[PDB]
């Protein structure tokens, strides 16, 4: 069983016992760790048990026992100045042919190491042989086999041994005097440096623990493991840690004896089986292990970690003895920040509190979210028609639901002739300017200047202007190319029968990349009456499709399409649907789906307040969102912003009542003095309480007319009052109630 032994006085030089003795001093152990070999010795055949010299001098000197029984102390380092080479390579032949099981140099003495042999018949096993610088100096242990032996860490005259099926303790003063306690585990006897009176032993798959003071029965019995244990030890650096290893296992078993329940744990050093392990004498929480592939990795046994969050969205965790923090902390200028940071920054920018021009909130929002531009532009359009002019906030699906009278067209002879119910719709969509305007010229002339031509092309075509769009798609189609080639095919169109143009035009459409020309071609390759290609396309804004429907479908066809689209919008959660649902019951479901999707209560609170009817503001789901936003504002200690929001919310929604607090009552009536001397009670005309500094009765009229310096002020603990300015001036230099024979520090009870 190859094992690893750390050098007694080296912090980076490690010894790993293998076929030939090998020493390495800090093989890429870790990402930033490398191990370098020093020397290799191979004079020892058939090694079974090994040990290292306790004294610093000589260095890299180890004592090893072979299979035939030879113990010849061997050095490995670059030594040319040996203090005593009399033991260099020297053996010490025992009197019997056997194999040494375990040997340990005594903690107190440098040159004394006792070894215990195999199960001999009538010849000793454990003897003290002096290394000096022929026969053992003290041999005992009759009728026993030394499976293991150990030295007392504190006592200079004590030791313990492991017999075949029992544990015995030996002393220097006397040999035959011992206390024998039988146990089922006799392997891996050791002493933890922190607790001297504790012992351990291993029994196959079971592990036992004992205490030296009352070593009669095991103090604790661990769970039996599948594979047999291979080595038992104790942590040298951290108190109260004991470990066990097994065969063909990649994760060790670590247990803490600090309970007086024993906390169990496991550490996996790598993905391959570890032959053995050892704890470096000085390195803190470090384990050096080896694998049979001549590759080594120094693992570590970490401590548990605790966690805690803060409203600023910073996370703090503890690891052992230290505290660490983490947050975005303006890590970069990239996208996808968490919604908490977004809402805090938007709250610092006065978002949603612009009443004069509603559409600016989408540049106040921050980055470009396509949903928050559609929503705010829709709400901007919904206010002009209301200021210029209640039926508007119901939504498209309500204004169109009352439509009556229309005519399906089947000819193409290339807007004021249609119902007003579909005129208000187009106004909301924004295709035409508000009023009796008859031309889409303004919209097209505004679309072209912003660089977007193809969308303008589709719009200009939808209202029957092929040759009036040929310019729009081939004039601004040279600077910054294709488009001329794309629109060459355009001039082949207009309502033929089965022919070479229409037959393939509807088949190669999917090759073209952009959506708007795809829909534009979709239009003219369809059986008059059906437009599925133009009406169901997810890469074309809801605006344009709704306008197309309101211009081309029939009365009994529009209403089914609107319902299907609105159901899709509601189940989806897209914010563009407010144009259809409106600020009605259905808008609440759309907002609820949005909040479930993203968790943004700011937009919901500032949106639902925009002139919704008193029926929907009473739904017990908008109030929950408003209250949650207010609590979020409270947590960040944004207290003036919350009051600003409260003012603008009480102005609009009058359903909710403000805060309820205390009021002052007259001493002779019992009634309130809230809302004909200003000084007397409004009820009984009797004096109100008088100030404690100026001794003049209090009162307030009910240029400024009631300034702050003349308001009431009173301690809530002792109930002594005065003017605001008087008390503010008094409590600067003194600290006690102005009234005599009082004791309150009336200002220190809060700060």
């Amino acid at each position: 069983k190859p094992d690893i032994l750390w050098a007694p006085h080296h912090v980076d030089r490690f010894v790993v016992c293998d076929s030939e003795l090998s020493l390495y001093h800090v093989l890429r152990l870790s990402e930033d760790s490398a191990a370098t070999l020093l020397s290799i010795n191979s004079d020892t055949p058939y090694m079974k048990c090994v040990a290292w010299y306790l004294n610093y001098d000589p260095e890299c000197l180890l004592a090893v026992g072979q299979a035939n029984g030879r113990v010849v102390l061997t050095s490995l380092g670059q030594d040319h100045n040996s203090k005593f080479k009399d033991l260099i390579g020297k053996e010490f032949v025992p009197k019997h042919a056997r194999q040494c099981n375990t040997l340990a140099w005594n903690p107190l003495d440098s040159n004394w190491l006792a070894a215990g042999l195999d199960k001999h018949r009538a010849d000793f096993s454990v003897l003290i042989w002096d290394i000096c610088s022929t026969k053992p100096l003290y041999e005992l242990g009759q009728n026993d086999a030394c499976l293991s032996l150990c030295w007392l860490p504190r006592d200079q005259k004590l030791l313990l041994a492991g017999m075949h099926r029992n544990l015995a303790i030996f002393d220097l003063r006397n040999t035959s005097q011992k206390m024998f306690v039988n146990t089922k585990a006799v392997q891996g006897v050791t002493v933890d440096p922190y607790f001297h009176d504790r012992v351990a032993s291993f029994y196959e798959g079971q592990v036992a623990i004992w205490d030296l003071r009352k070593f009669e029965k095991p103090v604790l019995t661990l769970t039996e493991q599948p594979k047999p244990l291979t080595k038992v030890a104790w942590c040298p650096t951290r108190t109260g840690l004991l470990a066990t290893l097994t065969r063909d296992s990649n994760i060790i078993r670590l247990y803490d004896m600090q309970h007086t329940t024993i906390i169990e744990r496991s550490v996996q050093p790598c993905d391959n089986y570890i032959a053995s392990f050892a704890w470096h004498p000085t390195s803190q929480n470090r384990m050096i292990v080896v694998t049979p592939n001549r590759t080594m990795s120094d693992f570590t046994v970490f401590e548990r970690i605790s966690l805690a969050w803060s409203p600023i969205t910073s996370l703090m965790w503890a690891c052992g003895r230290h505290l660490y923090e983490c947050t975005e902390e303006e890590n970069d200028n990239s996208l996808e920040k968490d919604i908490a940071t977004k809402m805090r920054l938007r709250a610092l920018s006065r978002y949603g509190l612009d009443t004069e021009q509603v559409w600016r909130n989408h540049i106040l929002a921050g980055n470009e979210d396509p949903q928050l531009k559609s929503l705010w532009y829709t709400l901007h359009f919904m206010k002009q028609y209301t200021e210029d002019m209640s039926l508007v906030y119901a939504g498209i699906k309500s204004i169109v639901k009352s439509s009556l009278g229309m005519v399906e067209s089947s000819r193409h002879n290339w807007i004021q002739n249609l119902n007003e119910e579909r005129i208000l719709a187009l106004q909301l969509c924004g295709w035409i300017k508000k009023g009796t305007d008859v031309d889409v010229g303004p919209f097209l002339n505004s679309l072209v200047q912003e660089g977007e031509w193809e969308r303008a092309a589709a719009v200009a075509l939808f209202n029957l202007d092929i040759r009036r769009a040929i310019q729009i798609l081939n004039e601004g189609a040279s600077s910054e190319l294709n488009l001329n080639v794309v629109a060459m095919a355009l001039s082949g169109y207009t309502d033929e029968k089965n022919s070479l143009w229409r037959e393939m035009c509807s088949t190669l459409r999917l090759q073209l990349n952009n959506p708007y020309l795809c829909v534009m071609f979709a239009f003219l390759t369809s059986e008059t009456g059906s437009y599925d290609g133009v009406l169901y396309e997810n890469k074309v804004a809801v605006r344009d499709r709704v306008a197309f429907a309101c211009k081309f479908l029939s009365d009994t066809q529009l209403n089914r399409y609107i319902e299907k689209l609105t159901n899709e919008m509601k189940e989806a959660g897209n914010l563009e649907g407010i144009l259809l649902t409106g600020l009605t019951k259905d808008g609440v479901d759309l907002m609820e789906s949005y909040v479930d999707r993203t968790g943004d209560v700011q937009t919901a609170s500032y949106c639902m307040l925009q002139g919704s009817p008193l029926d929907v503001l009473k739904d017990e789901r908008v109030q929950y969102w408003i209250e949650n936003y207010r609590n979020l504002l409270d947590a960040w200690r944004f207290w003036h912003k919350r009051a600003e929001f409260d003012i603008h919310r009480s102005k609009l929604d009058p359903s909710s009542k403000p805060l309820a607090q205390v009021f002052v009552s007259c001493n002779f009536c019992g009634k309130s003095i809230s809302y004909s001397k200003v000084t007397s009670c409004p009820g009984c005309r009797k004096p109100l309480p008088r100030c404690a500094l100026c001794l003049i009765n209090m009162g307030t009229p009910v240029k400024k007319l009631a300034q702050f310096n003349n308001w009431f002020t009173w301690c809530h603990n002792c109930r002594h009052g005065g003017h605001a300015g008087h008390m503010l001036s008094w409590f600067r230099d003194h600290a006690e109630c102005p009234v005599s024979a009082c004791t309150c520090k009336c200002m220190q009870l809060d700060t």
């Binding site: 970690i305 966690l307 805690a308 996370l315 660490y324």
Partner: protein, 303 residues
């Protein structure tokens, strides 16, 4: 997206638990020598110390805060069968009460959401979960015992339901750490019944049949459901939907394995979108949702 830094704070022992307050300006830590420390922030940004005192007889597992509308109140639970309540007088914290009804070691203590008053639930290793109240908010020396719940297992963690809407009844969830070689469910949820004024079992996660070290709920913020997080050999996220105790449609949305160890703690943030996790590999990982409502790892930090 996250960057780590070290914090100047001197400790002599190993820290067991860390906690924060409502605004994020105080913190409390408990160490191996049975000491609790209260740390205050400053305008500059540094942390200072304000108090230090030995508390219990045995080891101290936990410490937690309370809402500032009740004062400055702390609660600690330990190995010697007690839980204690501390209050600040100005600055030396004093003792108010000691809950001794237990017969084994208390494992977790938690304060209740605000709208139910000043309430506190503890849990032990014998299978009992207990709930206390204080009918007077200006007398913290007088507490009362109101409910007892028998779980027929070994409790190891509890969590409340933060939701404060008028349509949600109070809820609580209890985990177990027993390693008994069987196939019993190790997480059940108890719900209040306004009619009989008792607590009753409402659901039992029958798919979690392994040791559990931590559970946690997530803040509502006006959603239609509840989000739960479990800490077993893997990290999982469940959802509960409302449909005698009410009925739920329990789903599952996440099951992560990226620790290769046993995860110990889970904690949410104020909005309920990011999750923290700590495993036995010495790293802290953060998870988030995405556009496709699929949970994906965000950051990895090594301690």
């Amino acid at each position: 997206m996250f960057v780590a830094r070290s914090i100047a704070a001197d400790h002599k022992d190993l820290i067991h638990d860390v906690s924060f307050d409502f605004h994020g300006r105080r913190m409390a830590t408990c160490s191996s020598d049975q000491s609790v420390k209260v740390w205050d922030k400053s305008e500059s940004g540094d942390w200072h110390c304000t108090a230090s005192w030995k508390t219990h007889s045995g080891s101290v597992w936990r410490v937690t805060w309370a809402h500032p509308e009740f004062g400055q109140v702390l609660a600690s639970c330990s190995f010697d069968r007690t839980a204690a309540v501390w209050e600040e007088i100005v600055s030396h914290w004093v003792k108010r009460t000691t809950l001794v009804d237990s017969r084994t070691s208390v494992t977790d203590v938690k304060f209740a959401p605000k709208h139910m008053g000043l309430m506190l639930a503890t849990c032990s290793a014998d299978g009992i979960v207990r709930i206390y109240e204080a009918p007077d908010v200006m007398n913290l020396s007088q507490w009362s015992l109101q409910h007892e719940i028998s779980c027929k297992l070994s409790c190891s963690c509890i969590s409340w339901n933060p939701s404060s809407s008028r349509a949600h009844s109070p809820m609580i969830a209890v985990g177990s750490d027993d390693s008994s070689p069987n196939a019993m469910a190790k997480v059940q949820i108890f719900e209040y019944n306004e009619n009989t004024r008792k607590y009753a079992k409402a659901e039992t996660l029958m798919t979690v049949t392994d040791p559990v070290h931590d559970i946690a709920f997530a803040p509502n913020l006006g959603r239609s459901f509840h989000i739960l997080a479990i800490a077993t050999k893997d990290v999982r996220i469940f959802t509960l939907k409302p449909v005698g105790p009410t009925k739920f449609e329990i789903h599952i949305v996440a099951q992560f394995d990226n620790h290769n160890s046993q995860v110990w703690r889970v904690s949410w943030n104020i909005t309920g979108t990011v999750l923290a996790s700590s495993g036995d590999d010495g790293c802290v990982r953060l998870w988030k949702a995405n556009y496709m409502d699929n949970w994906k790892c965000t950051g990895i930090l090594k301690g």
